Symmetry: D3
Subunit: 235 residues, 6 copies
């Protein structure tokens, strides 16, 4: 059955870890685009300024949006994945989510996985925690999803995962916790943590390309910053 894997830039995307995880799937598997949501309905353009680029001689415009593409995995046991690469919208989240659920429906998506990253309290000197959230009582058993204590502000990931369950489409979101003292956008170690966890859930071989090297580089890069509150945040 087809699975939708989504990720959104901005507030639910602590090191761009989640957004680059899906980018990575789209790239490695050469994903074929078939839909972009109409930015006009969702995006404040002063907050999300569109950009101009030059193609041959000519000026062209890129809008913020959420784009849908299909990848064809994988083994002798083949499969379609529906990737959703978006910026978190600034308005009409209920419609936004309905729009994705319509695609999910037309495509017969059987499971929605959403990826995110937040800033947490774990050192770089140690592996990245990934935790799930689901309101599907079935999936809660069917994987080991530890639990959810969380009460507070939520984002489009939270909203989308809830829209799914109200729709009766099984969904789970995976969260990676990124060391808050080192939060700058290139974070290969946490991207990798997400991708590994997704693989166990979906049961799909993911090609990790240059990522395992990148993450090691990052760590033996950060380690050079020698002030050690990481000692404090380990005991």
């Amino acid at each position: 059955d087809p699975v939708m894997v989504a990720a959104f830039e901005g507030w639910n995307d602590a090191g761009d870890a989640a957004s680059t995880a899906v980018a990575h799937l789209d790239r490695e598997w050469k994903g074929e685009v078939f839909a972009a949501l109409d930015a006009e309905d969702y995006y404040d353009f002063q907050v999300n300024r569109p950009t101009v680029w030059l193609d041959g001689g000519v000026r062209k415009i890129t809008w913020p949006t959420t784009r849908l593409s299909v990848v064809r995995v994988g083994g002798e046991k083949p499969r379609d994945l529906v990737l959703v690469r978006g910026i978190e919208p600034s308005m009409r989240w209920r419609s936004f989510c309905n729009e994705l659920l319509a695609f999910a429906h037309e495509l017969g998506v059987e499971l929605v996985v959403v990826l995110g990253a937040l800033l947490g309290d774990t050192p770089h000197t140690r592996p990245v925690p990934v935790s799930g959230v689901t309101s599907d009582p079935d999936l809660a058993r069917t994987m080991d999803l530890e639990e959810t204590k969380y009460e507070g502000p939520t984002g489009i990931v939270g909203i989308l995962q809830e829209a799914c369950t109200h729709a009766g489409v099984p969904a789970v979101s995976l969260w990676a916790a990124v060391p808050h003292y080192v939060s700058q956008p290139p974070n290969p170690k946490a991207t990798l943590a997400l991708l590994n966890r997704l693989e166990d859930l979906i049961d799909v071989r993911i090609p990790l390309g240059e990522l395992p090297e990148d993450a090691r580089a990052w760590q033996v890069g950060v380690d050079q910053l020698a002030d050690s509150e990481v000692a404090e945040y380990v005991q």
Copy 2:
């Protein structure tokens, strides 16, 4: 390059000839759906009453809409077609058309063909006229498209084909003329006329299934209605 073939039920669809032509492509080539336009924006539901059907025990609802699917043709020289099967909307035609053009854009559609049928003044005792309309000066040469005298009310086919040219996406619509004295929805002869003409334009083998038989049946069926204004409309 990918081609979009569209057709709309109602006023531009004289014997359901055009709408069944695309249905036929979708069926024969086992087309895979990936998007439906949001009916909420386009359809007056008293004019286009949605229906209820029973699936196993359970009630389910079908809305009027315009649905998009992909077919993979064909030879050792393969190709993707994007089929659009719609009801003509009752409102916001400019947005409707923009919505299809966005899909066309994301998918890299290089040519849009729209199919239609109108009631004309040709006998059943004779082959079905199919004529093109284009505002692409190139295509006008590149095929033989005889000409357009037409001035008058237009439909979503007309509008869509014009939205394309303003967008700089080459488009043509093919029209079949259906004998007005015999206009009842099963019209295999004209469906076939459209499909033949499309094949010459797109250069794609179309499997005609039971259609060539159906059309012959229809004619040797109508012929039994023996009042002969068809004699009058031949000289």
Copy 3:
């Protein structure tokens, strides 16, 4: 717990039987209005022309709409009912229904009953059939709801009752069948049939005012039309 009883003029309202049933509840129980849906979003005004009336000297305008009021029943065992009196909208039915469901939610409505009438094949010489429709498996048992064979075009009643179950709000619609040979808008006998059936479902004493007389009058009125296909439609 609060119950919402809704009814819509037009296609689901064969003798205005259903719409006058709710009018009757609103009148007899002196229902207090608190909301009208914004007509601007739902109604084609050429199909539903608004009217002008004179209040004292002054011109005033009535729009088609769907209005919500509260009634306080009843015994030493009191209760609130939420009445919905609408015209069937011509557009955006999904939003329309969401709008009613939001009110239902804010008000803590525990059950939605929708009333309708259709033209059927029962004589005036015999009692009016009322049948239910529900997709709540619970209510299906909890009342005796015979069954649903129906597949075909549906209306806002059908849609609303389905929107409820998808929302997880128990809903049922009650249908009365009105003799098609006598379909003219004053139909007290069928209004009464609905009101009786509602009373059994909700367990609420409904004051029937002048209705029981009216219905008898109607029958001893129609009976004078003495051509007897009613004999044919009884055996």
Copy 4:
């Protein structure tokens, strides 16, 4: 001060009398267009099918809409008039009217006159009745506006004239009654009746061009239809 004169095709426009009155002003005074309302918001396009015309070689599309132009009258005592030429919209009348009132406001319009025609009970053998409607208590005195008994369905003219008074912009609509037995769209006699009455209200010389001849022609044309219920409708 600038005056807005509006007229709408369809239900408030019995012989196209009102719509051609404004057309006549636009033509004779060579009115300069500056705005069309966005059809997309107001018009059902199956009811108001847009048309295609040929300009030089090229196909071009005309949408139903409501267009605004400025005329510069007149004497040594000059004046601007704002003409509104529309089709009655099928939806969002409240917004439609607000949109016109915004233009009225930006332009500093001090008075809105709306023209209409209905089918009445006066013979062709006699002059055309024109009656006003206003809810401005001032104008009611300031002209002789006989009175308004009318209660019933209204149109966009009625709505617009009421939107004005709620907005505190003085407005009046003038109605001509067109003999119902002769209702076919060319009606120069009633167009002329409107134009005459407008002239008295606005105090503006209107050039009547070929109209006074046309109306005489029409009458000495209808008179030839010699069945005389006009005798009946005079006593």
Copy 5:
């Protein structure tokens, strides 16, 4: 006659003084909710992030919105109040205000009072100034409303109070000035100042619960912060 009392969190709500005043009315009088405005139309959700809470085991979502409830006061001389508790919207203020005015209309609201707080130049060592704003010339006399010099940026309170007068619904807003050097959200003294002034206007006994104590506590709390520009801002 029914009175609407509204208050909005954010920019017009200096110590949450105004928003807690209405909360207090809703709580003390056990107000019954009947409507929330559709957040989807008004709220940027990155600015107003919705929250997730746990109910029993289950995740549930709270959106920013403006909610309407009814309270039944009071004496042997009873009364209904309509409370409006909102966040100031970030968009479509004209529609927002129309939406509240529609409720006001359906409910027959005769007067709208809006509460607000701003940061002013009065010491904590002295009572809180409350001033009114009205464009109802009647109310201006009917209460003593000192005057309005104010010209500058306005908020939804300002807009709403103006929308009312244009609608011909009498409205006044009451403003409390909160010492700018002590602006942190718990401000019982100013909440109390609003409630007292409202009581004089509406002529309704308001139960002040723990507030009179709270305000005294606050003052004998702030007084401990002993730098005395309050001496400077008194002479």
Copy 6:
């Protein structure tokens, strides 16, 4: 032929240089307003707070918007200009631009010039650079428009100028570079630079009123600030 000159406050308007250039045209030529875009569709009102002013006694509200007026220039060789004075919208830029293009179309605008200012790296001790941007290959020759290297975030000016070319309406935007170390809103020198360049493009005498003096004042004003990185930014 009529020319549209537009300018937008905010991000594309470095010293309010561009916005005051158009203000200056509107003032000097006594431009007559005929349309404002509906703020409701485009503006976040917390970011663009509307203001209240007093007219005689009475409170009145000004919304952020984009307003259109006509000026009649000029010589024995007369001309109409359409001025557009706006704030950059925060949402629906595609519609915003379509709305302006509709006016352009109704008015028969043949060329659109958009004015802007950015912060650049030129000293106050030297003339203000103005550079053009166009995607009209014709205009690129027809004026000397040096070239465009620019790739990056764009604004409504960029978007509008691109919407024009896609629409087949020739458009160019003129940019002035304002010394970043002196960016405070009164910048007469750069306003003047824009106006001069516009004059050469449009071939229209622009009355500069007090501006040439103002700019000199500004420079002999800034020069007094005597830290000299301007020496550094000249070599």
